[PDB]
């Protein structure tokens, strides 16, 4: 039943007793459900240390992973160039999934095309699909550039992208001067950040490899900035603002902030902004190149040092106080521009916010997960705040990155209780937060289920989730946030301290029971 003046949707229409009686009859009559005592016992068992031992003995099964496949990152990288259509050679289901994943996170249109490979192609190859796809996409969508990445099916059958694109050009399906950079992006190897690295290296190679003769390092008096896989618009905005404040000439590469933030003014803009082809062609003439996320830009680093002959600095991601300071000092040393007073004041204001909230932040225990560079920057900032990272998980991390994070943890007294896990998934993390309970989780939306599980054990066992990272489907407009620089540190500090305070108010709201500590002023 519904009341027209107060219509109820699925929650809480199902809570009405007619529906409860229906569901009870259904369960008791036809579901053959295990008795509730058995279910409770099994759940309690899954929260134990013995279960955690069994769970960490896993070798073949992955449960609730915390990573994606390479072509998603390749598509994100391609979206950062002016009037560029991401083109994915292979099966169309992959493109449907990529578009929908990105569409939910940014609340924005994501444009990508597929050649729709079929079972007949698996034995004859994808070259006919490639020639038709390149012709069709160029005609109907009119892109300046087409960046080609590969699905796992194309990688398994061994399609040769270079030969396919060349034959399309010799055929006349597409013009011989039309830029078609490509990259092989296997889903089985690495993750989405690896795909971003491969796509960027393919584009840079395509535009610079055969024209290095006339290139002189430092002649255009700019610095190249490579952002890596970034899902926060504010990070692009802050990096541009800091560089412009210093008066430093810069050339951002693969920047999509404009395409993923178009206004709603009555027209649909498929393309907006992006790195131009002239910028990429002139990139080897820059003073140097900075990689903002070096731990997934290794192939790009090899190309930039080997071919462009740039002496790429050893910089961490500019997250938190010390690493932002080091990034700014390196930029100043490369360009010869002093650090201006506005950035000095911004740093001082961040330090003031740190002194203001240190009493609430000190000693809090965090579990956290994400991509390697973001995870290590967050761990560094947490140590700077006097917090304790307990469980550090990076599903797509490697051994060298783990060694670097361990070194960072050893440099602080607040890292004594930290353990770093690579190759582990969110079910492992669920066991970790049950057996060694921290105060908060930091991660993406997939953590919400873990929170639910802990609340099922009890309110005193619940571990609240703090949403920082990718993807964030449940929340709205958090993709506009910033995590880099002093501005990003300020935002993250505010989020953390106010999550702590909101939890404290939740715990002290009980009248005549816990509300003696329900203070007006905190």
């Amino acid at each position: 039943s519904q009341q027209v003046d107060k219509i109820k949707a699925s929650y809480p229409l199902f809570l009405d007793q007619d529906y409860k009686d229906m569901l009870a009859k259904k369960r008791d009559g036809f579901e053959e459900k295990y008795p509730q005592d058995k279910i409770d016992e099994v759940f309690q068992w899954t929260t134990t240390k013995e279960y955690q031992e069994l769970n960490f003995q896993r070798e073949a099964l992955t449960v609730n992973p915390a990573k994606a496949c390479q072509p998603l990152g390749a598509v994100l990288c391609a979206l950062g160039f002016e009037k560029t259509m991401p083109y994915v050679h292979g099966s169309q289901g992959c493109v449907a999934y990529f578009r929908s994943y990105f569409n939910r996170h940014f609340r924005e249109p994501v444009s990508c095309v597929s050649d729709s490979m079929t079972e007949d192609a698996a034995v004859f190859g994808g070259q006919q699909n490639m020639k038709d796809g390149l012709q069709n996409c160029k005609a109907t969508y009119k892109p300046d550039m087409i960046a080609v990445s590969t699905t796992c099916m194309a990688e398994v059958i061994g399609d040769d992208l270079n030969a396919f694109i060349n034959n399309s050009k010799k055929e006349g399906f597409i013009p011989d001067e039309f830029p078609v950079p490509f990259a092989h992006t296997p889903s089985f190897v690495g993750s989405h950040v690896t795909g971003w690295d491969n796509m960027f290296e393919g584009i840079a190679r395509y535009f610079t490899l055969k024209s290095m003769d006339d290139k002189v390092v430092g002649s255009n008096k700019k610095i190249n900035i490579v952002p890596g896989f970034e899902t926060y618009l504010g990070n692009f905005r802050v990096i541009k603002r800091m560089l412009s404040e210093m008066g430093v000439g810069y050339s951002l590469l693969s920047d999509p902030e404009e395409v993923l933030d178009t206004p709603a003014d009555g027209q649909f803009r498929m393309y907006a902004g992006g790195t131009t082809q002239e910028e990429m062609k002139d990139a080897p003439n820059a003073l140097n190149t900075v990689l903002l996320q070096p731990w997934h830009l290794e192939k790009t680093k090899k190309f930039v040092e080997g071919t462009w002959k740039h002496e790429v600095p050893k910089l961490n991601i500019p997250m938190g106080l010390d690493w932002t300071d080091e990034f700014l000092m390196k930029v100043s040393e490369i360009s010869g521009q002093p650090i201006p007073a506005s950035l000095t004041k911004e740093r001082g204001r961040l330090v003031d916010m740190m002194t203001d909230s240190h009493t609430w932040l000190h000693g809090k225990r965090f579990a956290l997960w994400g991509d390697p560079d973001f995870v290590m920057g967050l761990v560094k900032f947490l140590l700077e705040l006097g917090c304790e990272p307990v469980h550090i998980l990076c599903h797509n991390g490697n051994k060298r990155w783990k060694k670097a994070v361990d070194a960072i943890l050893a440099a602080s007294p607040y890292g004594k209780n930290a353990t770093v896990y690579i190759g582990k998934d969110l079910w492992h993390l669920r066991s970790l937060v049950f057996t060694d309970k921290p105060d908060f989780m930091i991660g993406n939306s997939y953590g919400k289920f873990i929170q639910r599980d802990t609340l099922h054990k009890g309110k005193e066992f619940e571990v609240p989730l703090i949403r920082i990272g990718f993807p964030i489907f449940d929340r709205h407009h958090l993709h506009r946030s910033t995590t880099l620089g002093y501005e990003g540190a300020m935002q993250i500090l505010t989020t953390l301290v106010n999550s702590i305070l909101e939890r404290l108010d939740e715990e002290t709201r009980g009248m005549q029971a816990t509300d003696y500590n329900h203070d007006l002023v905190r």
Binding site: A9, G29, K33, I39, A68, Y87, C94, A96, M153, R269
Partner: protein
């Protein structure tokens, strides 16, 4: 009604294409005639998508794992292959279920092989066996395992059927291999076909020799309802208010025991013909169970469906059906009285995939709304045969529409509202046109039955009449 203008618009939109793509796409665009009964003479469907045209279609893995097998709550579904597939499909479809996740229900979880280049080079059969053992260790209350193949499993020489057989007998556990590689077929519909074949071959006949379930003359099974926003629950209550007993529902909030119990029912009510007609026909041939299609979108279709379903049974059920209709009449009449004038005369264009574009037209008409455009991503000619009678004269019909095509059609027709998926939403919101997600219901379940209609009317009114649509043009421009 401007039939020549619709034909002219189709020609001008087609002008952009190269010759091969234009000749292919011209067969997938038609102007509706109600009198025509054979849709093959005007529109072509279920063909390969043109390359580089930004199609909306998915793959067979989405049709099988995402649509059919995934809702089964008490089974564990292994995405067999690289990590991407299961991660993008994890909990992206709102199939409502009641259970304890991670203990006895596993719908929102992602179980995956996480294949790596070694697994590609040397195969993943031993890894699959070890995975099955680990699953048995860590999730003891599971009632079955399905193995959904992704694109590499078919491309490399894996043989998951033998692993399923060997492991199944050893653990006394039902293990269902599904060959749903994404490169098979042209859309999700082949995924539906493969999933139904797996259901008949590995699950459906477990209790053929068993006669310990007590059956009644009023035993029915809901087929093809996936409980989006609890849609099946809204439909089931009505059936139980009519006196019938619902033994099973496929596959939303469904359990493997319900599937195994289905061959004992007296009637099969199939909500989605496209996803489940395969197994419905199989059960009619093998068990003698009749099946009928029904529609619970909007009061008119719901009342018609209830009366027909009751007509399949004796007079007590028909008397109960008249009581249910009389009980619910004032509520949907109040819904109409409150929301009909606000949405009266409004025009809608819908692209929803297999069953929904024809199915929801009656609900829009119940609110005085006219559906100028109906489109399907992966329907077959029989779906268009049912669609042409439902659709009005001189309206636009379109199969596997491209992004360019649908944008141009919307610019010309200028609908008041568009109902489609997540990959068109932001495009048309930036255009200034109100948009409703017709797959997830914009996270507002349910739209099915009498209780569903009240949410439907409220949602359509709140999006079409929203204040922001009047604010996209800056005052100074």
């Amino acid at each position: 009604m401007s039939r020549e203008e619709v034909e002219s618009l189709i020609q001008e939109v087609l002008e952009v294409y190269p010759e091969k793509a234009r000749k292919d796409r011209n067969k997938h665009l038609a102007v509706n005639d109600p009198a025509v009964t054979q849709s093959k003479k005007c529109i072509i469907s279920n063909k390969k998508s043109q390359p580089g045209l930004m199609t909306i279609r998915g793959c067979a893995y989405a049709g099988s794992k995402g649509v059919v097998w995934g809702p089964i709550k008490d089974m564990i579904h292994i995405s067999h292959g690289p990590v991407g597939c299961g991660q993008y499909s994890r909990a992206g479809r709102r199939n409502y279920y009641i259970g304890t996740t991670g203990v006895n229900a596993f719908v929102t979880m992602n179980f995956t092989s996480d294949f790596q280049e070694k697994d590609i080079v040397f195969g993943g059969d031993k890894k699959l066996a070890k995975l099955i053992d680990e699953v048995e260790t860590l999730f003891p209350l599971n009632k079955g395992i399905s193995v959904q193949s992704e694109c590499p499993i078919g491309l490399i020489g894996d043989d998951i059927e033998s692993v399923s057989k060997v492991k199944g007998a050893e653990l006394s556990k039902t293990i269902v291999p599904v060959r749903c590689e994404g490169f098979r077929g042209v859309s999700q519909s082949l995924g539906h076909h493969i999933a139904n074949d797996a259901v008949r071959d590995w699950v459906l006949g477990k209790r053929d020799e068993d006669t310990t379930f007590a059956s009644t003359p009023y035993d029915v099974a809901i087929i093809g309802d996936y409980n989006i926003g609890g849609d099946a629950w809204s439909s089931r209550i009505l059936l139980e208010e009519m006196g019938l007993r619902c033994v099973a529902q496929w596959s939303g909030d469904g359990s493997i025991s319900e599937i195994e119990l289905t061959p004992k029912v007296k009637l099969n009510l199939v909500h989605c013909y496209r996803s489940m007609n395969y197994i419905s026909r199989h059960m009619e041939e093998k068990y003698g169970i009749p099946w009928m299609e029904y529609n619970f979108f909007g009061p008119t279709k719901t009342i018609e469906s209830l009366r027909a379903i009751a007509a399949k049974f004796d007079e007590s059920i028909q008397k109960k059906c008249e009581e249910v209709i009389a009980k619910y009449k004032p509520e949907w009449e109040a819904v109409v009285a409150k929301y009909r004038p606000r949405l009266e005369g409004k025009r809608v264009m819908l692209y929803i995939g297999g069953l929904r574009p024809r199915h929801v037209i009656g609900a829009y008409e119940d609110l005085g709304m006219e559906v100028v455009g109906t489109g399907y991503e992966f329907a077959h000619n029989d779906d268009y045969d049912r669609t042409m009678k439902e659709m009005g004269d001189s309206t636009l019909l379109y199969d596997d529409v491209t992004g360019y095509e649908f944008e141009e059609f919307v610019k010309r027709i200028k609908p008041d509202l568009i109902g489609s998926g997540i990959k068109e939403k932001f495009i048309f919101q930036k255009m200034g046109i109100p948009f409703r997600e017709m797959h997830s219901w914009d996270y507002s379940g349910p739209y099915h039955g009498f209780d569903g209609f009240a949410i439907f009317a409220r949602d359509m009114d709140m999006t079409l009449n929203n204040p922001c649509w009047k604010k996209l043009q800056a005052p100074w421009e």
